[PDB]
Design a binder for this molecule. Structure first.
Ligand SMILES: [N]C(=O)C1=[C][N+]([C]2O[C]([C]OP(=O)([O-])OP([O])(=O)O[C][C]3O[C](N4[C]=NC5=C4N=[C]N=C5[N])[C]([O])[C]3[O])[C]([O])[C]2[O])=[C][C]=C1N1=[C]C(I)=[C][N]1
Ligand SMILES: NC(=O)c1ccc[n+]([C@@H]2O[C@H](COP(=O)([O-])OP(=O)(O)OC[C@H]3O[C@@H](n4cnc5c(N)ncnc54)[C@H](O)[C@@H]3O)[C@@H](O)[C@H]2O)c1
Ligand SMILES: [Cl-]
Ligand SMILES: [Zn+2]
Ligand SMILES: [Zn+2]
Ligand SMILES: [Zn+2]
Ligand SMILES: [Zn+2]
Lengths: 374, 374
C-alpha cells in the first residue's frame, strides 16, 4: 500500500486569485491520529469554489480547493473508528464533531470545528498536509478534494453504501443536500404552498426538486439565463420567469402574479440585489425568505426593519440544514432506493486535468454540474 | 335613547404633531351595519400612540388615538351577530376579518383590513364617524379609544368574560398580548433555553413573563433605566444588564455571558441600534431574533447577509402572533382562570381628562402601564 508513506500525486493549486489552476505534483503526508487519507474518484465544481478564485470569499493562498466529492479510503490514522480502508466515503465541508453546543442541538448544523467562520486554511490541529515545491499548501474547508489524495479529519468524512455510484453520489456532498435541504429542512415548505427559487444552478434546481417533494403547489423559477428553464420545468417548476423580460422590478411582478407574494422564497445565486428581491417577493404577513447563496465578501444590504414587523421570516443556512455525518449517509440510501435521481443535474463529466475547462463551462452557463473524474 | 343618534362626548384630539392633546366635545355618529359603538371604561397608554405624537409614525391628522382598551357595548349596528348591548368587549388594533388569505392561513395574523399598511384613518369602508367643530376627525388603527365613545367594525371587536376587571384586563388589548405572544407564539421559546429582552416597558415585561411561561431557563433583561430591574426580576428575569455600565458593546457582553450568544433575543423598544444588537447577541448558528418594537419612519439598518447564512433567524410580528378576534377572548379567560396577574405592570391610573400628564409619566420613565378611566 502507501500506508505510512508520503504520497506524491497530482492536485490543482491556485497560487493566487483571478488566475488559472496549475496541475501540480504535491506530497500528501500520512494521516495523523483521527485523520483519514482518501483516494478521489469524482468531484463536482460548486460555485463556492469559484468565489475563492474571483476574490468574493476570502481564504489563505496558495490553496487546493474542492468540497463536493466522493472517493475511497486509502488509509486511516490511529483512533479512527468510523471507517476502515477500502470504504467508500463522502468528505464534508462542515463537520459533525458530536460534542459541541451546535452539535448537541437537534436543530442546528453549523458545527464549531469549521473553517468558514474565520479561515485558517489548515486542518483541525492547525497543521497542513500538502507540500508543493517544498512550500506548505493550504487546505479549504478542511476537505481540499481537488487532489488525487486528501487528508480530512474523521468527523468530516461520511461512510456511504458500498454499492454507491461515486460518479453521481458526489453531488450529495454539497449541491443536492444543500438545495434540497433548504426547501425540506430550513424553510419546511408546506403542501399546497407557493415558492419562488432565484437561480437555477446545481444548488438552485435541487431546491425546485425539494419544494415539489414537500408538495408546493407552485414553483415559479427565476433565472436570467433562459437555457436553464427546460430542465427546471422537468424537475418541478410550474412557471419559469426571466427578469430581463419586464419593464417593472421582479418582486412586483411576482406579488401581482401571486396575490401578494409567494410563501417561501429561496435566493440561490449570491448577489445582494437578488437577496433583496427574494425578501421583497414573499408575502409580508406569512412569507419565509431563505438565503442559500454566499454573498460577496464584506458587502452590506440596507433593509427597512418594518418589512419584518408584519410577520416575515428571513434566515439562511449552510448544507441545507443537514447535520453532516448523519444526514449525508441517509440521503445516499434514499438515492439507492430510487427516491430521487441526480441524472438531470450532471450535464458534463471531464477528467481532473480538464478542471480549468470545467470552471469555464460554469462561466458560460452551459453546465448545471460538471464532474471531474480521476 | 342614544341608540340611533349622534352622541356628544369629550375626546382627546391630536390636532398637530408634537403638540398637546386637546379635550374637545365631539359628535360620534351611530354605528352603520356591522359596526359597534362602545362606551369606554378604561384605556392603556401604549408607546405606539406616542410615535404618532412624535411624528415617528405617520397617520392622517387630526385624529383621536388609542387602541389599548376595554368597554361596554352600547348600540350594535344592523347585521351584528357577535355582540349584543351591555356585553364587555375589547377593541382590536388588527382585525380578524375571517375570509382573507392571511385569516385563512393558520400561521399568519396581519389581516388585510388593518389600517397600518397605508393609513386612511377611517373605518373599513372609507368613512369616518367623528366630527368636532364642524370638521371630521380621523380614526387611528380603526379603534380610536381616547374618546368616551367610539364606533369600531365588528371583526375588530372581541367579546370577553362578563366578570372581567375592565380596568385590568384591557392590557390584553396590546401590551400583554404583544410581549407574551411574541415569546410564546412568534419566537416559540423552548424549555431550557436562554433568552435576552431589550426594553422593560409594559410590552417588554409581558415578554419576560412569556419566556418564563415557555420554560426559558435563563432570562436576561436589558435597559438603560435601572429602576425597571426589580419588576423584571419579580416577573421572571434571572439577570438584568444596564448597557451604560460597560466599556464593551452590549452584544459582546451577552455573547461572552452565554458561550456564544442567547437562543432567543427580543427587541421591545423601536430603535435601530438595539435592533442591531439583538440580532448580533443571538448565537450565529442557532439563535432566533424577534423584533417587537416599532421602528421610526424610513430608517434603515445595514446588514451583512453572512450573519444569516450561518443559521440565524430574524422575524417580526404584530399582536404577538394572536389572531385577534379569538386570541384576546381566550387570554382574558386564562386571566379569569387565575393564571396570571397584570398588577405589576400597572403603575398609575388617572381620569381620562389627565391624558397629557399620563404621556409625561411615560416620558419620565417612572411608569410602566398607566390606565385612564372613564
Ligand atoms: N449555503 C450553502 O450551503 C451553499 C451555497 N452555495 C451557493 O449557491 C450559489 C449558487 O451555486 P451553484 O448552484 O453551485 O452555482 P451556479 O450554477 O452558477 O448557479 C447560479 C445561477 O444563478 C443564475 N443567475 C446569476 N445571476 C442571476 C441569476 N439568476 C437570476 N438573476 C441574476 N441576476 C445563473 O444564471 C446561474 O443559473 C453560489 O453562491 C454558491 O456559493 C453553494 C453551496 C452551498 N456551499 C456552502 C459552502 I461554505 C460551500 N458550498
Ligand atoms: N409589535 C407590536 O405589536 C407592538 C405593540 C405594542 C408596542 N409596540 C412597540 O414596542 C415598543 C415598546 O413598547 P412599550 O409600550 O412597552 O414602551 P415603553 O416606553 O414603556 O418601553 C421602552 C423601554 O425601553 C427602554 N429603553 C429605551 N432606550 C433604550 C436603550 N437604548 N437601551 C435599552 N433600553 C432602552 C426604556 O427605558 C423603556 O423601559 C415601542 O416601539 C412600541 O411602539 C409594538
Ligand atoms: Cl367621512
Ligand atoms: Zn458547495
Ligand atoms: Zn460540533
Ligand atoms: Zn382577514
Ligand atoms: Zn399597542
Amino acid at each position: 500500500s502507501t500506508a505510512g508513506k508520503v504520497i506524491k500525486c497530482k492536485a490543482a493549486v491556485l497560487w493566487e486569485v483571478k488566475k488559472p489552476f496549475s496541475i501540480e505534483d504535491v506530497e500528501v503526508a500520512p494521516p495523523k491520529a483521527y485523520e483519514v487519507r482518501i483516494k478521489m474518484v469524482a468531484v463536482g465544481i460548486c460555485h463556492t469554489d469559484d468565489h475563492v478564485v474571483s476574490g468574493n470569499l476570502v481564504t489563505p493562498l496558495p490553496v487546493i480547493l474542492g468540497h463536493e466529492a466522493a472517493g475511497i479510503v486509502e488509509s486511516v490514522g490511529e483512533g479512527v473508528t468510523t471507517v476502515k480502508p477500502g470504504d467508500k466515503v463522502i468528505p464534508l465541508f462542515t463537520p459533525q464533531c458530536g460534542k459541541c453546543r451546535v452539535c448537541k442541538n437537534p436543530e442546528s448544523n453549523y458545527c464549531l470545528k469549521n473553517d468558514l467562520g474565520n479561515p485558517r486554511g489548515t486542518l483541525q490541529d492547525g497543521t497542513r498536509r500538502f507540500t508543493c515545491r517544498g512550500k506548505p499548501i493550504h487546505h479549504f474547508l478542511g476537505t481540499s478534494t481537488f487532489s488525487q489524495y486528501t487528508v480530512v479529519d474523521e468527523n468530516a468524512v461520511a461512510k456511504i453504501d458500498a454499492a454507491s455510484p461515486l460518479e453521481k453520489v458526489c453531488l450529495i456532498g454539497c449541491g443536492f443536500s444543500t438545495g434540497y435541504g433548504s426547501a425540506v429542512n430550513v424553510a419546511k415548505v408546506t403542501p399546497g404552498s407557493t415558492c419562488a427559487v432565484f437561480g437555477l444552478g446545481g444548488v438552485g434546481l435541487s431546491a425546485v426538486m425539494g419544494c415539489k417533494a414537500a408538495g408546493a403547489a407552485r414553483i415559479i423559477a427565476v433565472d436570467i439565463n433562459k437555457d436553464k428553464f427546460a430542465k427546471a420545468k422537468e424537475l418541478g417548476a410550474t412557471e419559469c420567469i426571466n427578469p430581463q423580460d419586464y419593464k417593472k422590478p421582479i418582486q412586483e411582478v411576482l406579488k401581482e402574479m401571486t396575490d401578494g407574494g409567494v410563501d417561501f422564497s429561496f435566493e440561490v445565486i449570491g448577489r445582494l440585489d437578488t437577496m433583496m428581491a427574494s425578501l421583497l417577493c414573499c408575502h409580508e404577513a406569512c412569507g419565509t425568505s431563505v438565503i442559500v447563496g454566499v454573498p460577496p465578501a464584506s458587502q452590506n444590504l440596507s433593509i427597512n426593519p418594518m418589512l419584518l414587523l408584519t410577520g416575515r421570516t428571513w434566515k439562511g443556512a449552510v448544507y441545507g440544514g443537514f447535520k453532516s455525518k448523519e444526514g449525508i449517509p441517509k440521503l445516499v440510501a434514499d438515492f439507492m432506493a430510487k427516491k430521487f435521481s441526480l441524472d438531470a443535474l450532471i450535464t458534463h463529466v471531464l477528467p481532473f486535468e480538464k478542471i480549468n475547462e470545467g470552471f469555464d463551462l460554469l462561466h458560460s452557463g452551459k453546465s448545471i454540474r460538471t464532474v471531474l473524474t480521476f
